[PDB]
Paper text:
Gp45 of ϕ11 was identified and characterized as the receptor-binding protein (RBP) of ϕ11 9. Furthermore, it was shown that ϕ11 was unable to bind to the cell wall in the absence of WTA–GlcNAc, identifying glycosylated WTA as the receptor. This specific phage-host interaction is determined, in part, by the protein recognition device located at the tip of the phage tail, which engages a receptor at the bacterial cell surface. The RBP structure reveals a trimer with a complex fold that can be divided, from N- to C-terminus, into a “stem”, a “platform” and a “tower”.
The RBP of ϕ11 assembles into an elongated homotrimer, with overall dimensions of approximately 160 × 120 × 100 Å. The stem is formed by a long, severely bent triple α-helical coiled coil that features three interruptions: the first and third interruptions are both β-hairpin structures and the second is a short disordered region. A strong electron density feature suggesting the presence of a metal ion was observed at the junction between the first two bundles. Using an RBP crystal and extended X-ray absorption fine structure (EXAFS) spectroscopy, the identity of this ion was determined to be iron, which probably exists in its oxidized form Fe3+ (analyzed at SOLEIL beamline PX1). The Fe3+ ion is positioned along the 3-fold axis of the first helix bundle and coordinated by the side chains of His42 and His50 from each of the three monomers. We therefore suggest that it serves a different role, perhaps by helping to stabilize the bundles that undergo a sharp turn at the hinge. While the first and second helical bundles are collinear, the hinge introduces a sharp angle of ~30° between the second and the third bundle. Helix α3 (residues 88–97), a short triple helical coil located in the hinge, has an independent rotation axis not aligned to the remainders of the molecule. Contacts between the three propeller domains are sparse, as each interface between two propeller domains buries a surface area of only 457 Å2 from solvent, and much of this surface is buried due to a helix-helix contact at the center of the trimer axis. The cavity is lined with polar residues (Gln165, Thr211, Gln330), which could serve to establish hydrogen bonds with the modelled GlcNAc molecule.
Residue numbers in the entry:
A (entry chain A): -1 to 307, 309 to 376, 383 to 636
B (entry chain C): 3 to 378, 383 to 636
C (entry chain B): 2 to 636
């Protein structure tokens, strides 16, 4: 009927006879295709009649290139002309040939041929020169990459929720997520993931991972892998690898050793180059070597495909001093097209930060350049990265900076890129806004949320009545949830505290306002809602389910109690029920206690107000205060 | 990439996944080797050198190149052997420009011509290659593989799915449609950052699936499908205006005798001056053709002249207008009809297809998944072909209405030529509360009648003189002696906003008021809420006020001096001109106010007077007096 | 040799995984071997083929390469060539071109060959020139006569006045703008490339500041300005930027005074050609009826440095470009062209951009500039003032014509830069600094400019900030005394007005205590004008303790900030009602009064007993006495 030579690429999800039968079928098809390729090559070489046309065959002799068919046609034509061609009047035919195409009569055939060839040779060389010059100009405009000369351009800020200097950063060319490291006090390092505008996404604490100076980030068949330098239970060095996940990770079965036998004799860290599929290693020489080699750090270039199994150092180079302390310690490392980029060094403050370039094969210093920024008109180094654009193949040298003293630590990425790379990186994600791009309220991330504290991105939001019903952390009990609210999520501090402001969407009722601090990393640390009184001249009613005034404990939130409603309250002053309207005031006290005031809404009669304190201190009695009517 | 040779020793997800991966890689490698061998056989120019080709005749083996050299050399020697004594001028001509002496004139001419022919072909090859590289870098346009890039959000004040959008290349205004109940559609105009400008309700317009937008001698025209009074299909044109429009004298019929036999809508291509029509088959026609829609390509000039001539026509197969894959977007560019389909839910992906309009063939079908960073499910919503006025560069715009159910947020994504997306993203920066330099934004009106007319979010400042005319100010005119900071904040998706007024005071308290406004109807505007804040300053009652009953703002205290107390006609009769007092204004029912006058006594006994007044009547003052203690 | 296993194990065993591993490795090796074999066949194999496998077909001949070679060799032998005369056979043979075509004559063959190559090379040359012309038009097109101006940024000085001029520093990206002031002064404000205010200089008796020449000399920026002396005489000078105030005298250097001080003289500096372009006025004695008011001189900046008087090119500006309805607003120069921007704000007539060829004096173009669009809501009819500038990019040498605008009216006055640039210039200028944000780009709190600041009023840029406990300790303008400084605070700096009043909001970072909130207005140009902090009460139900170091209730003066006093604590207050110490818990309320005075209420935290509250007023009015109010216990 038909027979498809196409392989089964969608397999059975269960190990069956069918799963085996699909694999055998594929291997049978592949075996036949391979046997056919082997037969085809042999047949091409030995039997195929018209393996090629003669036009596909080069014929070259003494600086002349033609093809076999055209040269055969040429030879046959030379024969045919000698047989068929008329014998001319020699001299007169030669005399006629002295006249060039413009009609100019040269003195000799050789003069004419010389003039013709020279005219075309000079012309074609002039066209070739213009081609090379236009191409050189085009390539310089588009692909110029000079880290020794170009001024770094600001790309973005990086906003982790950790107050520490940045060790390293890596921009994922596929997802555009930024992976950054920050050392933590207990020989741990924090690995934060950010959006390309620097906005925090999530994080991973690498427990006993050391300082996190740098990691190698490698994609393997659409899956991302992180190659990290760590420490075990005994604080001994280990070069391991693992896939990202949020939360925590420690040396054990959760991560894979690479080649422990050759790397764990020293501190071993690495960076991955996707262009050449190389894995560049930065290994610390043992303390005893620092006195003899005068080189505190060394770099070894190895292959990634070869790192998946075999041991082979392609090129090795010692990092001289002063490129590793005291006034110039290592702050950044990257690699591109046979050049090792090295960023030094501390600074705070006096001494400038330097970017160096070394030829990894010759070990020579190619350039040393001062790196300084003046756009926030001191500044300290924080990592290097080599960005390779997935769509265009274009590149940029990324320079990470951490600016300010201690508390005021802010991080930024600067770049030296090829044409359009910096503009692309700066504009992947617009900077964080309180609204959408058009100035409208941002959408909520959850429908009828269990926790309002789950809204962790700053912004102006709106919560409808039905979306407040499930809230477990709402400022008002469920009996009061009859309205829509404006929600403002504002920045807090550098470690995860944010502010949240709720305002009731009321035109004919007062705009109730509450504010709190939330800890986005632990809701148990969330602050209580602060009621901020504001009033438009409207009354506030008590929900009908409430029969005790003692249930009303929000400080500064008044209620109106009509004459009829006053009968419903079991804790209402006994001899003051069903006679007048009252304003209930709820005032401050100690934790577990409340102060309440009921003030009469009297018109011709004497003013009366009743005060009580109640809670853990006991159920206090009401005390009456009465005034004297005057004119 | 590389074949996985170390497989999982446990039959699980990774085993099946990497087993499938290997077979996909093997399939590609087999196809590549077959292509290489076929290309070697049929197309490679210089598949071989002649020295690799055996020439064997009488048990003597040579190669093709050396035998060709031998034959050519024989020929020339034969010519020299039958040339008499030659011609010296011809002998001289055997020497080429380098000084190399060839055997015959023919050998010299051959060599010269070949040298120049090979050289000029080498220059031509470099020209074509440099130009191909340049054109690929600058003008690559591949909707089948390029990843859509976020351009902007669209922010209408209509909470409905977007039907269509069009980016005006001259003004940069975005024209978007949203279907409304009652068979109307709303046409909203937005800034290129999505900010709402104004809108037009197209009464009995239908769903507003798409309009054709065309400039005719500097005048913008909108070609729409609309309904008449009898609910009959009318293909029309009209120019934009705000408010409302309906079928009649305000709309011009466009070839009614040709299009009004069915539902007809259009899109306009400015490059080829084509109007592309999407038309419906009637229920009876649908089963026979297995198609709901058909597309007609016509000249816009022919439309202007009223001449009926279908240049190219194509039926859309039902699978592209189905329950699972309904039409969500349509556009056209350089002989290709782009068709966007998708469902709102069910984990079925949305698709972008491209059809060759001339041959009717499907060129590509691709899943459109905005699995990016600006997204962190998708509801497909329109296509547009943006054509840059300055450069002629283009982009395929993809509209998305995202969000789980309600409320809807809209965004434009793009597949563009070099620099187009960067340009579109940055025409207008995203909305800010300040100007670009962090300063207060300018007010849209000087001495405004209504503060509610300030409808764009932002931080503003109103000078004393610009508060004088306000008809909706939180304080009466007697109190308008200061500048105020005005903050206009987002409210909800439908048009409610918040407004906050704060008095610019250094030596007086910073009075603060807040309200909700309805930007579409000021009658729905909320009352101003006073938010008390105090720096320790007193607040004076304007001299023009002689009744304490005029002071009704809750929480706003006033100080009354001994002399001032005499002026108030409603001051407790026996308490005038004897002391200073603090007037407190407290909460009550609507139409009523509570007031407290507390004495500013120093050595004498404290006194305070309370009253309630308004619709409940003019309540009497009640005195409360304390006992001096140590 | 090894073959693929096609009969696999029927159980997911170790044998199954191995057989699959073996096959994949064997497939990979076979494909590598096939690819090596094909590459070797193409490039190195000697006798890759026999000539019989290679097709030779031409017209009525169908053959293979080997048989055709045999045929040609055979033709050699049986060919009978005549002894046709001296050079006869050689000339005849030369008539055959490289394709094997036999021309009738040597001249015909040479004509054909030359013409073929001449036509071909001219075709290649035409494509080269066309590709280059297209490339240059795409990259370097600069047409102020037709290109549409693009919005770059707003400019945000702290001065309410029309902008006279602006200059974008290509090295620092700082924008230098001038605004005329009453009293014949001009304000020179420096801004970030997003328009954010940095600092300013008041050029006392500087005149209008119509335009300055900005020039770098050995890494030093110099400003060449028209200024006036004490006698209101015109002085052409230079000075380096400083903040504050400057006036004619020792701080300003005269620039060829004997040449330029006979009239009003202002300049612009072109860095490409190192030219100083002068705009000068004709004096009334030099003018007849409708004569021109202004003239422009082109001079070398080297000649200016050396004090050499040499006008390279001069041109009078026709009166129609310096009129009541078309007065001068902007001036710039580029590549032999003088750009002139005219406009009258209140007459509703249009604004124009003109280009003049400075050498020939001819008008090249006149176009209406209407920048009313999506970026200005679309306030085109309100274009109030304008300036021009030529931006020259340091990195690329690319350029842009910058068009400055002020859109009015009066108080609603706002400034913007629009541009007509070469490819990528506008995108570059728009994105040097992102527009001002309340947060960093990732939505986090912005860093503070000072550690443990003396004044919070020194934080003058809008934004959300955080101050740690230790950084509040030495604040001289904090809303609470030092005894209360035990917490971190959120600080919000908000815009105020156009002249420099900003708002500051402080909120206590409290989860288990109330979030104390204070707000004030600051004058960023004079802290003596700073307002007092307003306390905004908000309460989560927590009590507030009086620091143990405080023993006077009279020290607690913040209005609306309540404190709780325990029975034990009530004994330490020297101003507590004498007969009410150590008997109960109390809530202290602090209420409004006149400046210099405070009202305090002590309300008892009684449970079964009668409620009591005590009121007092104290301060400049005297130390008022406490008054007791007692209630009656009811059921
Ligand atoms: Fe071959």
């Amino acid at each position: 009927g038909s027979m498809s030579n196409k392989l089964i690429t969608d397999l059975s999800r269960v190990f069956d006879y069918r799963y085996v039968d699909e694999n055998e079928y594929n291997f049978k098809l592949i075996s036949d295709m391979l046997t056919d390729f082997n037969f085809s090559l042999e047949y091409h070489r030995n039997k195929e009649v018209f393996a090629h046309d003669g036009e596909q065959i080069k014929y070259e002799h003494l600086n002349v290139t033609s093809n076999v068919s055209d040269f055969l046609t040429y030879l046959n034509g030379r024969f045919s002309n000698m047989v068929l061609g008329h014998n001319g009047d020699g001299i007169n035919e030669v005399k006629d040939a002295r006249v060039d195409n413009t009609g100019y009569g040269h003195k000799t055939l050789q003069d004419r041929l010389y003039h013709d060839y020279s005219t075309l040779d000079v012309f074609t060389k002039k066209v070739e020169k213009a081609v090379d010059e236009h191409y050189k100009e085009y390539r310089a405009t588009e692909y110029r990459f000079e880290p020794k000369e170009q001024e770094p351009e600001f790309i973005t800020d990086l906003s982790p929720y950790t107050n520490a200097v940045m060790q390293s950063f890596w921009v994922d060319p596929r997802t555009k997520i930024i992976y950054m490291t920050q050392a933590r006090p207990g020989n741990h390092y924090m690995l934060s993931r950010l959006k390309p505008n620097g906005q925090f996404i999530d994080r991973l604490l690498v427990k006993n991972g050391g300082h996190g100076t740098h990691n190698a980030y490698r994609y393997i068949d659409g899956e991302l892998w992180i190659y990290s330098a760590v420490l075990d239970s005994n604080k001994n060095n280990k070069f391991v690898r693992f896939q990202y996940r949020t939360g925590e990770i420690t040396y054990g079965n959760e991560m894979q050793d690479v080649m422990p036998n050759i790397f764990n004799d020293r501190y071993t860290s690495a960076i991955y180059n996707p262009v050449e599929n190389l894995m560049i290693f930065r290994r610390e020489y043992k303390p005893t070597e620092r006195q003899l080699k005068n080189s505190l750090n060394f770099v070894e270039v190895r292959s990634a495909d070869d790192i998946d199994k075999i041991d082979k150092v392609l090129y090795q180079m010692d990092i001289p001093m002063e490129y590793t302390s005291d006034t110039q310690p290592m702050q950044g490392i990257t690699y591109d097209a046979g050049i090792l980029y090295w960023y030094t060094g501390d600074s705070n403050t006096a001494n400038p930060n330097y970017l160096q370039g070394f030829d990894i094969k010759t070990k020579e210093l190619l350039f040393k350049r001062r790196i300084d920024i003046g756009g926030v008109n001191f500044q300290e180094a924080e990592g290097l990265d080599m960005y390779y654009d997935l769509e265009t193949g274009r590149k940029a040298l990324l320079i990470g900076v951490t600016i300010g003293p201690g508390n005021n630590r802010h991080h930024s990425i600067y770049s030296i890129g090829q044409r359009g790379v910096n503009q692309f990186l700066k504009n992947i994600a617009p900077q964080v806004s309180m609204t959408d791009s058009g100035g409208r309220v941002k959408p909520l991330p959850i429908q009828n949320p269990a926790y309002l504290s789950d809204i962790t991105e700053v912004g102006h939001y709106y919560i409808y009545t039905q979306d407040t019903q499930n809230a477990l952390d709402f400022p008002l009990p469920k009996a009061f949830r009859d309205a829509g609210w404006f929600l403002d999520v504002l920045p807090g501090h550098y470690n995860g505290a944010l502010r949240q402001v709720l305002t009731r969407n009321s035109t004919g009722r007062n705009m109730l306002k509450f504010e709190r601090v939330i800890d986005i990393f632990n809701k148990k640390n969330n602050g209580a809602w602060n009621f901020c009184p504001q009033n438009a001249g409207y009354w506030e009613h008590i929900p009908k389910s409430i029969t005790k005034l003692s249930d009303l404990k929000i400080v500064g939130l008044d209620f109106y109690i009509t004459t009829e409603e006053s009968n419903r309250f079991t804790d209402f002053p006994k001899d003051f029920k069903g006679i007048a309207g009252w304003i209930l005031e709820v005032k401050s006290n100690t934790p577990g206690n409340t102060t309440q005031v009921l003030r009469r809404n009297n018109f011709p009669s004497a003013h009366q107000f009743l005060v009580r304190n109640f809670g853990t201190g006991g159920v206090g009695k009401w005390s009456l205060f009465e005034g004297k009517v005057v004119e």
